[PDB]
Design an enzyme around this catalytic site. Structure first.
Site, PDB file in Angstrom:
ATOM      1  CG  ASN A   1      -2.178   1.058   1.061  1.00 27.72           C
ATOM      2  OD1 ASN A   1      -2.792   1.089   0.382  1.00 27.72           O
ATOM      3  ND2 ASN A   1      -2.022   1.817   2.368  1.00 27.72           N
TER       4      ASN A   1
ATOM      5  CB  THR B   1       1.832   1.000   4.852  1.00 26.44           C
ATOM      6  OG1 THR B   1       1.727   2.319   5.556  1.00 26.44           O
ATOM      7  CG2 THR B   1       1.918  -0.023   5.836  1.00 26.44           C
ATOM      8  CB  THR B   2       4.725  -2.363   1.806  1.00 20.59           C
ATOM      9  OG1 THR B   2       4.637  -1.442   0.665  1.00 20.59           O
ATOM     10  CG2 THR B   2       4.974  -3.773   1.352  1.00 20.59           C
TER      11      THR B   2
ATOM     12  CG  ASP C   1       5.741   4.328   3.188  1.00 19.34           C
ATOM     13  OD1 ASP C   1       4.623   4.065   2.423  1.00 19.34           O
ATOM     14  OD2 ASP C   1       6.659   4.684   2.168  1.00 19.34           O
ATOM     15  N   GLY C   2       3.998   2.920   6.893  1.00 18.65           N
ATOM     16  CA  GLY C   2       4.164   2.040   8.033  1.00 18.65           C
ATOM     17  C   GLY C   2       4.905   0.737   7.684  1.00 18.65           C
TER      18      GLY C   2
END
Lengths: 331, 331, 332, 332
Positions: free
Chosen positions: D202, D244-245, D283-284
């Site tokens: 994501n 985020t990925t 991003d997380g």
């Protein structure tokens, strides 16, 4: 020396949440601490069927947070650098579910808005409280929701309340483990406010300012509590060869770096009142939260010293408030 | 209560290393601790011209290490997970140079072999000791080399020796700061050996097991030492509004995970004897070193308890050895 | 055309150390000089021919906020401070941290040996293991660090075999396929935003260009080409298991400590595009992200090219490209 | 041929939450099923159509040693344990961590509510923010996590819009250029060495193939093509600053906690090849590296393909390729 509260032998095999129609109870504990800290609310709920519970610190505006997850066996959800609530619970890792109940309730209050700046952030931490009772009931989503619903400003239920229902100390041997509780303390200094909340479930014991062991490691054969190191050292001589979850909330503005170091300082300070502490067996987690209302002066001088008014000074004061909270939990 | 050792006012502007023909002196301190720990040697050297020095722990076989660099203002070189020597020094960041002298000397002893498995690994840490004297002399490469050359088994010079020459405590106000020293302590339990070495230069004060402040924050107007929190809390009420470097060496085999948690536990335990501790102003660094000679039993029971023989137990014992070392430094 | 090989050759044993030689620092000039405009930042590179080995020093006399991303498994780091007057990159494995001590002492002497807190001179240092690429044990010592500082000038960087890059090498599945790299730098100015990347790739992995071609390291003299290490690794597993890079990114854009730390992590990870594998157990990969705190970003992140287009992440993406250019200069 | 666009479309406000619907979990089948052979590992994927949003659960009933590399600036993580019986990946931002609680409770019930230390069921969970890609506030709740566990089977993974990938999207310089991704998996067996990669990209950044082509995210409907975000970022700076990925890698190779932690960092950094930028503040990004501890590596690292060719770094390089394949499946 206080009367013993031995937890007694484990009873594994008891009923779990599915076995009951679980009714949340608003926890009142042994007495209520009252304090003045606008914008901070506390709620505590339990299931008698455990007994087990959750304690929620609600800061509706949201507050900057640092987490010091120092223990070897931590059970943490979120751990965010900004929180609307902190949820402390029993039930080991299962009790992280209580925080989901808080998050969902806050989403509903926000009318299900989901913009980044509107995300409701709850950090949760847990203690393993299953050896101190004979059921498998845990703090579930419904119980976290209840603790939030019961939250009010300026009150904290001391003792066997919320997450502290089945907290215990002194785990060299389970025949000597004693029930603790949860505790809080509060100080106001000028405009500065500091609230400490703690749920000590340590492997170690609670120690007072004189160095007396006051909760944990009580031997019914002797009538006396022992510092664990005396047991450990004799065990080594014989055989070789033959968790505490806590929050400090303040209104003083601290940068992210100051706040993080403040957390570490206050957390380490708790090795004065809990011994040993920060062990492999513990999941010790401290949340340091600031509502960012009061500036420290730009220079650190006072009549008490050239380097007397700064974040380290605040950390030393907060450390004392936290020791007071630990002793309330053990009382 | 011990007689005061006030450091006195800063004198900045003094001569540095270039101004002198600096002769290393083998430090003897006030007395020598003797102990039995094969494979571990300690050397200490100083320059009288500072006064400032370095203390080196040499383990020629190399030993597994964990570093807990917990302070806000750490001065660390290497920080390796395996070391042939640990070098502790004054001179603030300049004193990291002493460790280079140790590394070079060890390279020469290895006949300049440079295979990966032959690299000689030295971790170094420093204290800022320039406010406790009126020169800018620091522990240089030559002084680190000398400390290694002076290393011998089973001896440690207590007090004003090596890195402890100009160590000091209690820094709310420099008019109340007192000279400390370095300290060591040793215990043997069955086959288990634990050596603690410490150089306390804290912002906080040294506290004994009764809770008495025994070094630092001495007010010549009163003749009495005060816990810093009393100064801090009054400073806040008035105005708002109006480093310790250490090593624990043991012979017990611990996995990397156990060793790292052991380091954190022992380091936090030092907030009992140094208060406050782990502050933003401190560069507190602990090295936990194991020579990996003795197995713990596979199960943790003894007559003293079901959970009495494990790495946490070792950590609690080591914590006591370290408190004894801190008190030797402050004596 | 594929680049010509620069094989390092086999390891050589028994070689002499520093005091076997009368060691004179040489100002490294490399293969080419990069020129750029970034007042307040100076670069000095010195080497000992007798190694060959060297040190590269970035001097920022105002002092600059720094984030360190020590991501590798075999890091050799001194100081690692969140505020630095200099960064020292050196050969000689852990022994080469001594070069940073030379820089620190030289700075102390410029301050007339003053030692107040606000005047402590802070130098962070990191090292590569460069002893497999030559047959002496000479390392960057205090004198060499001092010399690299003394040689530091603004607006110049010596590309290639210069300073810390003198004996840097890549591609270490087998030493018979390892090639000499060098050091590299690149610079971009976007308005008055300035970004300088400096890198000393001594990777276990290989240098890869933007097309995905391996361009330095893992040169097989039996085939005349370089392939990605993963081909060797996968073949090795089928057979036997049957059924360091040190770098700095310097910018003039103000970033909070939190932004700067995340920026460091982003730019450092981005280097797994140009160096593969990267961040391995065998590597001591360490990146320093430095800001001279001269220019603010706009308070809101919009532009014609998007609502979230002007922010520290954007700066990180641009800086990542500057760093890849620097890596390719080192491998050239 | 360039891939057809899958633009997410503009954000939509005012949408209902979970209890507005009678929510039935749906077993996600995606666009295609990957089949593979890895006994002891099961994957379940469930979604709510009304979101659309979902959860993907990896169940390893023996429990498995795990390293977590929470490298992003905006991580949503629960547990993050060094030993896990399940990993739960979900949409719904932080609210979706609740799905993991559903998995934990379901596992507790399989253990007949036993609560001894050795029987505590450990689930680590991570989330993506998927609310910009749809116009409801439905999230993966305890019931959905439970359902994903109940649907878990060995040797199958539903590619594409399935489970946590149902509303995943890429390329967030501007929401007008953001495209739906999906989830992806890839698997390799080398002898009896097994490597499974699972990813839910994501990202703020875009998905990039091995040739360096942007293949998902940052699609400009005014040009009909995708370009790298850095072109937008550099243009934005020239304009506005004038002068985020979540993922898992599962293997059967024994690795010590130290090796496994470094392996996690290596594989996670490697994903900046296929996702660019990556590891950003926005991003997380969280990777779980899991070993089922079935096969030892040889005690020495040699083979015909080199002296240092068979070791955890080698395994990391191979795993990195499996992960890039998984990312490209998610973007396909």
């Amino acid at each position: 020396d206080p009367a013993p509260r031995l937890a007694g032998p484990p009873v594994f095999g008891g009923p779990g949440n599915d076995a009951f129609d679980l009714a949340p109870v608003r926890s009142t504990g042994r007495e209520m601490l009252r304090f003045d800290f606008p914008g901070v609310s506390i709620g505590a709920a339990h299931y008698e069927e455990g007994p087990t519970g959750a304690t929620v610190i609600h800061i509706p505006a949201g507050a900057r947070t640092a987490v010091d997850a120092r223990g070897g066996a931590v059970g943490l959800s979120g751990g965010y650098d900004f929180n609307h609530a902190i949820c402390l619970a029993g039930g080991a890792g299962y009790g992280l579910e209580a925080g989901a109940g808080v998050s969902r309730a806050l989403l509903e209050r926000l009318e299900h808005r989901t913009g980044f700046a509107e995300l409701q952030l709850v950090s949760s931490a847990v203690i393993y409280d299953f050896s101190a009772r004979s059921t498998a009931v845990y703090p579930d989503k419904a119980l976290g929701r209840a603790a939030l619903e019961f939250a009010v400003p300026g009150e904290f239920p001391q003792g066997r309340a919320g997450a502290g229902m089945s907290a215990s100390a002194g785990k060299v041997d389970w025949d000597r483990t004693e029930i603790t509780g949860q505790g809080a303390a509060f100080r106001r200094l000028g405009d500065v406010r500091i609230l400490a909340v703690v749920v000590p479930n340590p492997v170690g014991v609670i120690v007072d300012r004189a160095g007396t062991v006051v909760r944990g490691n009580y031997d019914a054969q002797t009538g006396v509590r022992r510092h664990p190191v005396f047991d450990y050292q004799e065990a080594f001589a014989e055989q070789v060869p033959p968790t505490t979850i806590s929050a400090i909330v303040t209104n003083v503005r601290m940068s992210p770096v100051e706040l993080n170091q403040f957390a570490k300082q206050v957390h380490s300070s708790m090795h004065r009142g809990i011994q040993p502490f920060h062990t492999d067996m513990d999941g010790d987690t401290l949340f340091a939260v600031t509502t960012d209302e009061i500036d420290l002066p730009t220079t650190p001088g006072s009549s008490r010293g050239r380097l007397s008014v700064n974040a380290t000074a605040l950390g030393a004061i907060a450390s004392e408030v936290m020791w007071d909270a630990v002793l309330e939990a053990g009382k």
